[PDB]
Amino acid sequence: TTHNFVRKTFFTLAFCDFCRKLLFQGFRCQTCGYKFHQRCSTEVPLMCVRDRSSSAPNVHDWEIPDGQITVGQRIGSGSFGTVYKGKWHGDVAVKMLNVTAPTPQQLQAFKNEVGVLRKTRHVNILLFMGYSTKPQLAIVTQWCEGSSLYHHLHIIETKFEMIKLIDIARQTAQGMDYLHAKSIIHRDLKSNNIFLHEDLTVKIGDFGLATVKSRWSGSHQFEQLSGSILWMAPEVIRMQDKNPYSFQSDVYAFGIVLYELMTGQLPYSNINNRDQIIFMVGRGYLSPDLSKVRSNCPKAMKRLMAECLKKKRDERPLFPQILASIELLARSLPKIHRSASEPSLNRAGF
Amino acid sequence: DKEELVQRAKLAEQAERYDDMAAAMKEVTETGVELSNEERNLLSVAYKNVVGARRSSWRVISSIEQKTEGSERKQQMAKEYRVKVEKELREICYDVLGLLDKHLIPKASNPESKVFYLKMKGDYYRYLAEVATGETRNSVVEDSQKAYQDAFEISKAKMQPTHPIRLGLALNFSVFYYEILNSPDKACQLAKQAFDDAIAELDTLNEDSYKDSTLIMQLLRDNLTLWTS
Amino acid sequence: DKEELVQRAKLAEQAERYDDMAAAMKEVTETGVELSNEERNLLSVAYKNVVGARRSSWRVISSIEQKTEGSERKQQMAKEYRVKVEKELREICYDVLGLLDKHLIPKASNPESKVFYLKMKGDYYRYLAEVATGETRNSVVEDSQKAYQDAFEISKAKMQPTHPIRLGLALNFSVFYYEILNSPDKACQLAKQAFDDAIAELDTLNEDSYKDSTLIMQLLRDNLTLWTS
Amino acid sequence: QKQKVGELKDDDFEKISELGAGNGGVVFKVSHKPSGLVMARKLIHLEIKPAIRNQIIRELQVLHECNSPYIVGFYGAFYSDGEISICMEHMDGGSLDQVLKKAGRIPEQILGKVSIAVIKGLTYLREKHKIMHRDVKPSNILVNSRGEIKLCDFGVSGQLIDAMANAFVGTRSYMSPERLQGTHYSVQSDIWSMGLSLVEMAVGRYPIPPPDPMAIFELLDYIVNEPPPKLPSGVFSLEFQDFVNKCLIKNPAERADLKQLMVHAFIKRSDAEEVDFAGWLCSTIGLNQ
Numbered sequence A: 001t002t003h004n005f006v007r008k009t010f011f012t013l014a015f016c017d018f019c020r021k022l023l024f025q026g027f028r029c030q031t032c033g034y035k036f037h038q039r040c041s042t043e044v045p046l047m048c049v050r051d052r053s054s055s056a057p058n059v060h061d062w063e064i065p066d067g068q069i070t071v072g073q074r075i076g077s078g079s080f081g082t083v084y085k086g087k088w089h090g091d092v093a094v095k096m097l098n099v100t101a102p103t104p105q106q107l108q109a110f111k112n113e114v115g116v117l118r119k120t121r122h123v124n125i126l127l128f129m130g131y132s133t134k135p136q137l138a139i140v141t142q143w144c145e146g147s148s149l150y151h152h153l154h155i156i157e158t159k160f161e162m163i164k165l166i167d168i169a170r171q172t173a174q175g176m177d178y179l180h181a182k183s184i185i186h187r188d189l190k191s192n193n194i195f196l197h198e199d200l201t202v203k204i205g206d207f208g209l210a211t212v213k214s215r216w217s218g219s220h221q222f223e224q225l226s227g228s229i230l231w232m233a234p235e236v237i238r239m240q241d242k243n244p245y246s247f248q249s250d251v252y253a254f255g256i257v258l259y260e261l262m263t264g265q266l267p268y269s270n271i272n273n274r275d276q277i278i279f280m281v282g283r284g285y286l287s288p289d290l291s292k293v294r295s296n297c298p299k300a301m302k303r304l305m306a307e308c309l310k311k312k313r314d315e316r317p318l319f320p321q322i323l324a325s326i327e328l329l330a331r332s333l334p335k336i337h338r339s340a341s342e343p344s345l346n347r348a349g350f
Numbered sequence B, C: 001d002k003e004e005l006v007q008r009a010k011l012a013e014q015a016e017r018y019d020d021m022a023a024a025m026k027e028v029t030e031t032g033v034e035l036s037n038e039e040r041n042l043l044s045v046a047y048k049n050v051v052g053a054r055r056s057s058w059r060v061i062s063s064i065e066q067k068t069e070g071s072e073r074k075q076q077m078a079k080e081y082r083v084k085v086e087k088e089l090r091e092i093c094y095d096v097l098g099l100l101d102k103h104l105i106p107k108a109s110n111p112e113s114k115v116f117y118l119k120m121k122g123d124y125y126r127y128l129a130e131v132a133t134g135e136t137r138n139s140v141v142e143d144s145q146k147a148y149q150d151a152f153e154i155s156k157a158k159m160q161p162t163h164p165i166r167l168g169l170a171l172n173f174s175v176f177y178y179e180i181l182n183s184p185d186k187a188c189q190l191a192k193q194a195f196d197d198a199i200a201e202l203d204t205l206n207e208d209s210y211k212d213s214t215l216i217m218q219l220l221r222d223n224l225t226l227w228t229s
Numbered sequence D: 001q002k003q004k005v006g007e008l009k010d011d012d013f014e015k016i017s018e019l020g021a022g023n024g025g026v027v028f029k030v031s032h033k034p035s036g037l038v039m040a041r042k043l044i045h046l047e048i049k050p051a052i053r054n055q056i057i058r059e060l061q062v063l064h065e066c067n068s069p070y071i072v073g074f075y076g077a078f079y080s081d082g083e084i085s086i087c088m089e090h091m092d093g094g095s096l097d098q099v100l101k102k103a104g105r106i107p108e109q110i111l112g113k114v115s116i117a118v119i120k121g122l123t124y125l126r127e128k129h130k131i132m133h134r135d136v137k138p139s140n141i142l143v144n145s146r147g148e149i150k151l152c153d154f155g156v157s158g159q160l161i162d163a164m165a166n167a168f169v170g171t172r173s174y175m176s177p178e179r180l181q182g183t184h185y186s187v188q189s190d191i192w193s194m195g196l197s198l199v200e201m202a203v204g205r206y207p208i209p210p211p212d213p214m215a216i217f218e219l220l221d222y223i224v225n226e227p228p229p230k231l232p233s234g235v236f237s238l239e240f241q242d243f244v245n246k247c248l249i250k251n252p253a254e255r256a257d258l259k260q261l262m263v264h265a266f267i268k269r270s271d272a273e274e275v276d277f278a279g280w281l282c283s284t285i286g287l288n289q
């Protein structure tokens, strides 16, 4: 239960696990991999369960009119609208936003939001092809073939090799990092809003669109909590904050997706009540149990999941750090699956 | 064949060995054929990692040299080990500049490639500037000064205020101003100016480089917040 | 003279350069000087890290060799490069084994140190057992069977079952049984026997011996929870 | 009439009208053409593994034997087109939630007859089947023009309660403070929910927030950490005030049981009172006697 440290000069890209700046040389625990600085060593304790300033690191009207969208079969309803498979220069996904009567004030904010969502182009992001005002509101996104992550993990329950499982978690962080890079809060990240395009490329959908959720009464948008709470951060549950939907609220939701992929079960699988979860989670009494994980999950990898689920939002890391950490062990994955050996002894002192 | 050499160098890069990689990429450049965009980043990573390991060795040996504070043969031996690793450090940087100014800089069709190789040249002259203390300092300091000024003219002319390379040049040239010349006023001015122009075209951020762009951005902000204290 | 070369070896350890420490400790043990606790401990660290780095690289190269077999003669150059790694892996390990026959084994006046050197011999035969296949493996593994069998006896008769050297001996011999001979039930029993004995005699240790023992037994619990499932 | 109904199929039904919108489900007045009767068909769309769905339909067959004058009649529960269909007796008076908005407030003498129906409804479910309702609220107490007051949406399928707990999110709650904290006290939680329902309709406002809107989390935190709601003094009889007080004691053990409430001064008075409930209901709604 004691951290043995080693002088290690990181050759790849790594961030200190207190200060979270670019780490070059410092210390590493040979148990977990909780790498950290030498400068801010006297501020941070052990957690397993004048200096040279940095340099260059290494290098590796959008409104659709009537008579164009052939609205096909009803697919399913959501928390702010229902999906139909429409035709529009190929297969698209139409969404009749629950807000059918938007005020000239809500309508303007929607057109402004669509402006940003239309300027998004990433391999791990579902394409946003505008909307339609004649037949009410109906977001039109790229039609996904195959099936959702929620469908593949809790419907058919077809578990995949940890290699393929980690890869899905990597590509999600890749698409999520892009959204936060363009300062877009997802407000909805969950396995239901992640599709596996032809079984390989991760596609994140139903992101942003803050103005079509929580119906307005004039010029306001108090987010009336609705939809699903298994992914909602405790700060988001309370809604007591002026805004509960931050990057960290999205990072927490991401941490719940990690739990889903890792254990194959949705969090809190021992409660037959929704209201009990809303209250206890928002009160900081209920947490996703970390005793139902596999008996081969490295401490370094598992710890990342635990960091995203921090009750206080300010403790959770950001996606540039998460994606680096996810990738970090994707490379040390096969070598570390083999049995443990005799370690090097203490060789440290503070 | 070139592809066997670049696969060998790439494979050796995956194995975390930066001696066979550097030897393979020196053997690539010795052919005297112009590199792609892809083949160049490998060369920069190899000859950054090799000096980086010796830099870390130099820093910790020099800290122990300033830590001992006695009168014995330990200080003489630590000085012998410092001049040893310093000479090893000199041999690597001279091999790089010998491989750079004979095959790549004089045969550089792409102006973007010219900003890249002149950024590398200024970097390795700064790497020799920080270690060599005496009369020879004033030669390599002025050499890096000319190299970065030459790169800064073409950056201001025909580059984007949101391109990774111009941001890297601005970053290396700002830390050059702070560490080597110790004029933090012009380094503060430079980094603030480079950071402001970097804000203008924040909308113009394609997938090709969002991570690099925001990574040099937050590093620029960290350097600013260190220096304004 | 000796204290100067041990100071150099420590200075090499802090500077992360390990090939200098390997040479600096081999030249010290080359003489036949009375080897104390710290003096043999630095040698153990040096010859652990140097072979360990190349062993992890071989693990990566062997994994990348078997990524896709439905491919061209790109694997051809890889498994000859793997042989290049093996050419700088076996002979450096032989550089350690001949050393055990030169000074270590005959110049031992404490059984504890004899268990330590016999454990190191068996561990370096264990590292050679992985890459070596065919009839060589048989020849390689037979040298360790007698090496750990001539150390366990002394470990049981001369040191307590809570001793970290005996704990490390049981640990390395447990992974030898699991990975090489593939008798995981004997590995599971041995460990359980080693761990139960450790719990049966606890809270008798020194003040210094409250970090290393716990770390080994903690890795023992990690192996046992890994090997139950 | 139930013996005329064989196996329920989707194509045997014809849509008449929607009874009302719901949080998770939707209810339609439908005509079973083979039998020629007007049923209330609830359709629940759950994205669950077929093994759980098949168990839900299996545990709903328990409703065939839940026959009493204070339990909403049941015709059949089947699965088709990715929706669970629960076909039950149509109640033309709607829910007391609908009747409450139409009435503004419900008179004490009317709530006396509702209390007796809910108590005897909860008693039947717990004695004959030993199943806790776990959802007592005005929307789940149904009334018809004949003057019948019947419980519905009770937890006969434990697998169905877990299914919708994962799927939807509520804005209004009637959950007892001990259940919110993960403490199970049998039917004591259902009695809390009844008392809270009785205060809502009598005052004509919601019990959880008292003037003398809040998010679901602020409502649950209030139920757990604040004193329970109570009837306004003077405008209701002391027996009715004492009845709801015994139903809203936060301590689930000190809270009155079904046997204790059946012989309460309020119930014994209301049981004796002659109240034309069927006449009042049709008058309140606007129907004809």
Ligand SMILES: Nc1ncnc2c1ncn2[C@@H]1O[C@H](COP(=O)(O)OP(=O)(O)OP(O)(O)=S)[C@@H](O)[C@H]1O
Binding pocket: A075, A076, A077, A078, A079, A080, A081, A082, A083, A093, A126, A141, A142, A143, A144, A145, A148, A188, A192, A193, A205, A206, A227, A228
């Ligand atoms: N862009 C799309 N392409 C293909 N299918 C889609 C798309 N969007 C939604 N669907 C399908 O529609 C079904 C449910 O639709 P949604 O309304 O997205 O449900 P939801 O994700 O719970 O709702 P929200 O608003 O994201 S909480 C899923 O089973 C999907 O297969």
Ligand SMILES: Nc1ncnc2c1ncn2[C@@H]1O[C@H](COP(=O)(O)OP(=O)(O)O)[C@@H](O)[C@H]1O
Binding pocket: D019, D020, D021, D022, D023, D024, D025, D026, D027, D040, D072, D088, D089, D090, D091, D092, D094, D095, D097, D098, D139, D140, D142, D153
């Ligand atoms: N048998 C019925 N007769 C009339 N209305 C009904 C019947 N069953 C359900 N309803 C109506 O269906 C609606 C949906 O109910 P449900 O989805 O269970 O949630 P809730 O009762 O909380 O609104 C309610 O408004 C209720 O009045």
Ligand SMILES: O=C(NOCCO)c1ccc2cncn2c1Nc1ccc(I)cc1F
Binding pocket: D022, D023, D024, D025, D026, D042, D044, D060, D063, D072, D073, D074, D086, D088, D151, D152, D153, D154, D155, D156, D157, D158, D160, D161, D164
């Ligand atoms: O109705 C329910 N919840 O409200 C819908 C929100 O989707 C409900 C909830 C739990 C349950 C367990 N077993 C059946 N259960 C329900 N159904 C139901 C029960 C009795 C009758 I009579 C008729 C019904 F439809």
Ligand SMILES: [Mg+2]
Binding pocket: D139, D140, D153
């Ligand atoms: Mg209901």
Ligand SMILES: [Zn+2]
Binding pocket: A016, A017, A018, A019, A020, A036, A037, A040, A041
């Ligand atoms: Zn730090």
Ligand SMILES: [Zn+2]
Binding pocket: A003, A029, A031, A032, A033, A034, A047, A048, A049, A299
């Ligand atoms: Zn650790």
